Amino acid sequence: EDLPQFLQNYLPNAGQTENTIVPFVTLTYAQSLDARVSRPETKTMTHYLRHHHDGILVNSPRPIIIDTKQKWRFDGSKMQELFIKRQGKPPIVVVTSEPIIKEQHVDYAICPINDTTKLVDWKKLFEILKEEFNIRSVMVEGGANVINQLLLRSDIVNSLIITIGSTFLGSSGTEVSPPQTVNLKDMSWWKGITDVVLCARLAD
Amino acid sequence: EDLPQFLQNYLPNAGQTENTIVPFVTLTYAQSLDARVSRGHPETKTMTHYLRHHHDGILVGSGTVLADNPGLNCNSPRPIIIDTKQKWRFDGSKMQELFIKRQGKPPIVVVTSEPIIKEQHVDYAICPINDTTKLVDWKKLFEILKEEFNIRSVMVEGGANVINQLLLRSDIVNSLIITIGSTFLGSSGTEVSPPQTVNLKDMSWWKGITDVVLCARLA
Numbered sequence: 001e002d003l004p005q006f007l008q009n010y011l012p013n014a015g016q017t018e019n020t021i022v023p024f025v026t027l028t029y030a031q032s033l034d035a036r037v038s039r040p041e042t043k044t045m046t047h048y049l050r051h052h053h054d055g056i057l058v059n060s061p062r063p064i065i066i067d068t069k070q071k072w073r074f075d076g077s078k079m080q081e082l083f084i085k086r087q088g089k090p091p092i093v094v095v096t097s098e099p100i101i102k103e104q105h106v107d108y109a110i111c112p113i114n115d116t117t118k119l120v121d122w123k124k125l126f127e128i129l130k131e132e133f134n135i136r137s138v139m140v141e142g143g144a145n146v147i148n149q150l151l152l153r154s155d156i157v158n159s160l161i162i163t164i165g166s167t168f169l170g171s172s173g174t175e176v177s178p179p180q181t182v183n184l185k186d187m188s189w190w191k192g193i194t195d196v197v198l199c200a201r202l203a204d
Numbered sequence: 205e206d207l208p209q210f211l212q213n214y215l216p217n218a219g220q221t222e223n224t225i226v227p228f229v230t231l232t233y234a235q236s237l238d239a240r241v242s243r244g245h246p247e248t249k250t251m252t253h254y255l256r257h258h259h260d261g262i263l264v265g266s267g268t269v270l271a272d273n274p275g276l277n278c279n280s281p282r283p284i285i286i287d288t289k290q291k292w293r294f295d296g297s298k299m300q301e302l303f304i305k306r307q308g309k310p311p312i313v314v315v316t317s318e319p320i321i322k323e324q325h326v327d328y329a330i331c332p333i334n335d336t337t338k339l340v341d342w343k344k345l346f347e348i349l350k351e352e353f354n355i356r357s358v359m360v361e362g363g364a365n366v367i368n369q370l371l372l373r374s375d376i377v378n379s380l381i382i383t384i385g386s387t388f389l390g391s392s393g394t395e396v397s398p399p400q401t402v403n404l405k406d407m408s409w410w411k412g413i414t415d416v417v418l419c420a421r422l423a
């Protein structure tokens with residue numbers, strides 16, 4: 001439809017991160033009016049987006065998983081079923097240390113922890129993804145926890161793509177809301193019938 | 205502009221022909237992307253005045269009048285203030301100054317008991333409390349406003365606390381009109397989000413340059 005023409009200027013631009021060690025990073029999610037991501041007609045856009053990124057963090061993109069605590073498992077996942085049926089890629093799993101036992105077909109990005117933050121060094125992580133795993137572009141889709149952090153990272157994020165659904169999920173839903181104010185620039189809105197989509201960049 | 209035609213069906217006198225004992229109520233407010241109305245834009249201002257000029261009354265909770273000391277004006281609508289603790293003072297407010305300058309009407313103040321200190325030119329709406337919620341009965345309040353003060357239609361600009369309640373009342377709210385700006389106020393700002401899921405119907409969107417507006421009705 002006209003929706004790709006709408007997205008076009010916000011997709012990875014190759015000459016932009018070429019000759020840099022950082023990948024293109026887009027932040028994308030779907031929220032209700034009350035800014036909640038949990039507790040149509042979106043699916044076309046999301047799939048289109050996915051097929052314009054090398055990696056997707058949560059041809060066909062490679063799944064990337066944050067799992068520093070090392071509880072997650074590829075064996076017996078839906079993602080593994082898709083992979084076996086030749087319609088999906090195996091994951092890259094972000095860890096802090098080399099796992100004692102590893103899984104067949106799984107890659108492990110060993111990424112250091114930022115000394116100031118309690119959490120993981122995002123810029124480092126994305127560099128590892130690009131330099132070690134040839135991920136030239138990544139679409140991060142979720143962890144409201146993850147969204148909330150990266151909203152603060154204008155030195156990292158390149159595109160912001162938000163779908164807003166014409167509904168209220170309720171106050172106990174998990175919210176996306178950065179801990180400080182965040183300004184946008186180069187915004188562009190699209191309107192559907194029940195949805196609206198925002199494309200933008202992060203100022204600074 | 206295309207904004208009046210976008211709003212047309214959602215205004216009080218697209219409510220058509222029947223008389224009602226409850227006034228036409230629209231719930232309307234401007235939020236950040238993270239659903240915040242406060243901190244922790246051009247074109248919105250004109251629409252807001254346009255909306256105001258089409259309502260008999262404009263309702264805000266206390267706090268809204270205590271944070272901003274708002275004019276609530278636009279001939280123009282009667283300000284209606286929910287202040288059951290009787291802590292707001294018309295005397296020396298922006299609203300008084302507008303009233304003294306013939307640019308605004310004096311306010312109706314909603315209380316739950318006999319007003320202790322009555323200010324000149326102010327009207328007091330003594331409304332029953334909802335025994336179930338312990339708060340003021342919204343339905344009775346709106347009916348009193350229509351019966352005792354001749355308010356045929358009311359625009360609640362809110363207070364998040366008021367919007368969070370009223371978002372649940374499909375039996376009261378006739379229209380919902382929300383402006384979403386493309387910024388984040390941050391989690392410390394005061395949010396509008398109801399305690400339970402709310403479904404909408406008859407929704408239509410309007411997109412401006414940096415903002416978008418939703419008109420809808422409560423399912």
Ligand SMILES: NC(=O)C1=CN([C@@H]2O[C@H](COP(=O)(O)OP(=O)(O)OC[C@H]3O[C@@H](n4cnc5c(N)ncnc54)[C@H](OP(=O)(O)O)[C@@H]3O)[C@@H](O)[C@H]2O)C=CC1
Nearest residue numbers: 233234241265266267268271289339340362363364365366
């Ligand atoms: N940018 C925008 O479009 C909007 C901005 N805002 C702003 O954001 C802020 C939000 O307001 P907020 O702090 O949530 O509070 P509110 O302005 O909604 O008012 C809260 C108070 O009003 C009284 N009240 C509300 N409902 C009842 C009831 N059913 N019975 C009795 N009393 C009731 C209570 O007063 P009490 O218990 O003290 O007697 C309550 O504590 C305000 O500053 C407002 O101006 C709000 C809406 C939209």
